[PDB]
């Protein structure tokens, strides 16, 4: 499994690529693996994961929420992985065939997928909740390693790594802005992700080593 | 929103030549493109304005998005600034996601397309058993704009009786995934097509066929 460092991994959602840059240069000898999203990627294009790999020596996860049908799902993660990014996150609510087309991309250009199964927001319980065991073992039988659960509900993530077992990868977001409890999280996630927490703080390294200092033993 | 022919061009071509010659084939027939992930993490966000210079069209940005509200509102934001008209979102991640959206929407002048249930076999597996309620959701919500699949016309007319007569619903899947255009305009007010025009030997006489054969509707 991808060896994450601090277990913690820094949601960059800052939409300014000087900002961006700034707060992920400060917090750089803390964290090796930023995970890029949409409004990142939106704002300042596909070349920022470029521009990350070159200033920084950190691991990229593009948080792309992949949700469309198997043939525009290939199409996104090619575009993707060919522009630098290591791992894809998915969801796995469109269903099997959605996700299959981003394993098999996965599979061909060298890379990982990650499936969303629960996510960590009050409206995740009108749908999303129902489904979320199934879509578990759904990524099991589908052969998924790499899982994001929510760390707004410890007993939910606690289901979710039962059933994709110890051995599979499991990071979590929720932490810190969301309410999410970092020590308690790190009971069943690998991983951890903070956003704002960090990216908004004053002082973004300091905010960083306070998080690290109160997981320590873990 | 006045689509002409009721027909929209889902420009997922993933090279900027190829998708702005494609586009200007056909520039005629459509005044409407739906413009996707393939095409902007292929090319950029700048190619939505650069869509709207070449052709006046109207765009719609087919970002099916799913996040928690904080992370919309952003999405959002960046796309309605790059000069989209239009987002389109999914219902299953809940209520105050879509809402997140609906905001956003209502400050830029644009407007939110909730996506209720998908076209592909996948679908069937969790999406189309909350399908009806998000469907009602939506109109909980006061969303007007709707997208459902083409591929299942009990489906697509189920949706068009719970959003009503008044609302406008868009329906992909037409074409290479199997839905006849004729049957699905029964129920949707406008049809998208991807690869059965951009893949067309000659995308302008494949829309012109298409066009044909609904021209009495
Ligand atoms: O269940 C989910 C999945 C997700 O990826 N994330 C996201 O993880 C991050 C959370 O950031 P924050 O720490 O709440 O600022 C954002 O990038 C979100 O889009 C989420 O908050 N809940
Ligand atoms: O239920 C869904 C919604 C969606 O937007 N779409 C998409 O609409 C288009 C269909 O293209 P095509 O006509 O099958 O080539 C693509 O851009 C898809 O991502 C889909 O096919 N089914």
Redesign the interface.
């Known amino acids: 499994v991808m060896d994450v460092m601090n277990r913690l991994i820094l949601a960059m959602?800052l939409?300014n690529r000087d900002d961006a840059l700034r707060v992920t240069g400060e917090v750089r000898e803390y964290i090796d693996t930023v995970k890029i999203?949409?409004?990142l990627?939106?704002?300042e294009?596909?070349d920022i994961i470029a521009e990350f790999r070159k200033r920084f020596g950190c691991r990229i996860i593009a948080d792309?929420?992949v949700?469309?049908?198997?043939?525009?799902n290939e199409?996104?993660c090619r575009?993707?992985f060919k522009?630098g990014a290591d791992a894809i996150i998915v969801?796995?609510?469109?269903?099997?065939?959605?996700?299959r087309a981003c394993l098999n991309v996965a599979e061909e250009m060298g890379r990982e997928v990650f499936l969303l199964t629960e996510?960590?927001?009050?409206?995740?319980?009108?749908?999303?909740q129902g489904?979320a065991d199934?879509?578990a073992r759904?990524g099991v039988d589908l052969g998924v390693k790499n899982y994001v659960g929510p760390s707004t509900r410890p007993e939910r993530l606690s289901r979710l790594r039962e059933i994709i077992g110890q051995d599979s990868f499991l990071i979590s977001p929720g932490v810190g802005a969301?309410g999410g409890d970092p020590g308690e999280t790190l009971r069943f996630a690998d991983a951890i992700i903070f956003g704002?927490s960090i990216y908004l703080a004053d002082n973004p390294a300091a905010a960083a080593a306070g998080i690290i200092e109160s997981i320590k033993d873990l």
Request: proline fraction near 8%; glycine fraction near 10%.
């Open positions: 959602d939409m999203g949409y409004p990627v939106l704002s294009g596909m792309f929420k949700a469309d049908i198997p043939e525009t199409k996104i575009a993707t522009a969801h796995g609510f469109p269903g099997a065939d959605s996700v996510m960590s927001h009050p409206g995740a319980e009108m749908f999303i489904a199934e879509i759904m969301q704002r």
